[PDB]
Amino acid sequence: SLALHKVIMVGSGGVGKSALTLQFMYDEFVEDYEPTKADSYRKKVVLDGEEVQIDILDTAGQEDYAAIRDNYFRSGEGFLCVFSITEMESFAATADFREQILRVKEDENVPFLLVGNKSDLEDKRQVSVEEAKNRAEQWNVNYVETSAKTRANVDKVFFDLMREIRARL
Numbered sequence: 561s562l563a564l565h566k567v568i569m570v571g572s573g574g575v576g577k578s579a580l581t582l583q584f585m586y587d588e589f590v591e592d593y594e595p596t597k598a599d600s601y602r603k604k605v606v607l608d609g610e611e612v613q614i615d616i617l618d619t620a621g622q623e624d625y626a627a628i629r630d631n632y633f634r635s636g637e638g639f640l641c642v643f644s645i646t647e648m649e650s651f652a653a654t655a656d657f658r659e660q661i662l663r664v665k666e667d668e669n670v671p672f673l674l675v676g677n678k679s680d681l682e683d684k685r686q687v688s689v690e691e692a693k694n695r696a697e698q699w700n701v702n703y704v705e706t707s708a709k710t711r712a713n714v715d716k717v718f719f720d721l722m723r724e725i726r727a728r729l
């Protein structure tokens with residue numbers, strides 16, 4: 561009887577998909593989570609006063625068979641597209657995840673946030689706020705910077721994505 565919001569974490573390696581997920585789920589910064597391990601998490605949460613369930617698929621890039629990975633995308637209702645602000649190549653990689661999602665969901669308004677993680681490493685920044693905001697503007701998505709280490713904006717990205725799912729679906 562509860563809304564079930566199906567969230568999928570995407571992004572290239574080491575950007576913080578798992579750390580964000582585990583901070584959200586378990587209030588812990590986890591620094592050694594197996595890079596090849598994908599997992600699903602489910603939690604009851606109160607979204608704007610409504611009890612809902614969030615399901616998070618923390619993807620780990622291991623499924624290379626395109627039909628299978630497209631099936632995983634098709635199941636998702638919203639996407640956190642994560643890059644690390646400290647790795648420009650991970651920002652460049654977001655374009656591919658966007659295209660993969662769009663090919664399957666066929667809706668440019670699919671619930672989607674662009675997430676610049678590792679905001680606590682400003683001294684290592686390789687991706688400017690300006691360029692990330694410009695990309696988000698091009699895609700008509702919001703850009704949020706997070707830190708799985710300090711928990712900055714972690715609840716925000718999950719809740720705001722659920723708000724998009726709620727509004728759009």
Ligand SMILES: Nc1nc2c(ncn2[C@@H]2O[C@H](COP(=O)(O)OP(=O)(O)O)[C@@H](O)[C@H]2O)c(=O)[nH]1
Pocket residue numbers: 571572573574575576577578579580590591592593595677678679680681706707708709710
């Ligand atoms: N300083 C800092 N390190 C982070 C952050 N998020 C992840 N890390 C570190 O980056 C590494 C990779 O994170 P992980 O979540 O496993 O990356 P994934 O491959 O995208 O799942 C780990 O050592 C984390 O501790 C963050 O926000 N800040």
Ligand SMILES: [Ca+2]
Pocket residue numbers: 577578579593594595596597619620
């Ligand atoms: Ca991971």
Ligand SMILES: [Cl-]
Pocket residue numbers: 596597598599620622
């Ligand atoms: Cl796995």
Ligand SMILES: [Cl-]
Pocket residue numbers: 598599600
């Ligand atoms: Cl799983």
Ligand SMILES: [Cl-]
Pocket residue numbers: none
């Ligand atoms: Cl609570």
Ligand code: NA
Pocket residue numbers: 694697698
């Ligand atoms: Na612009």
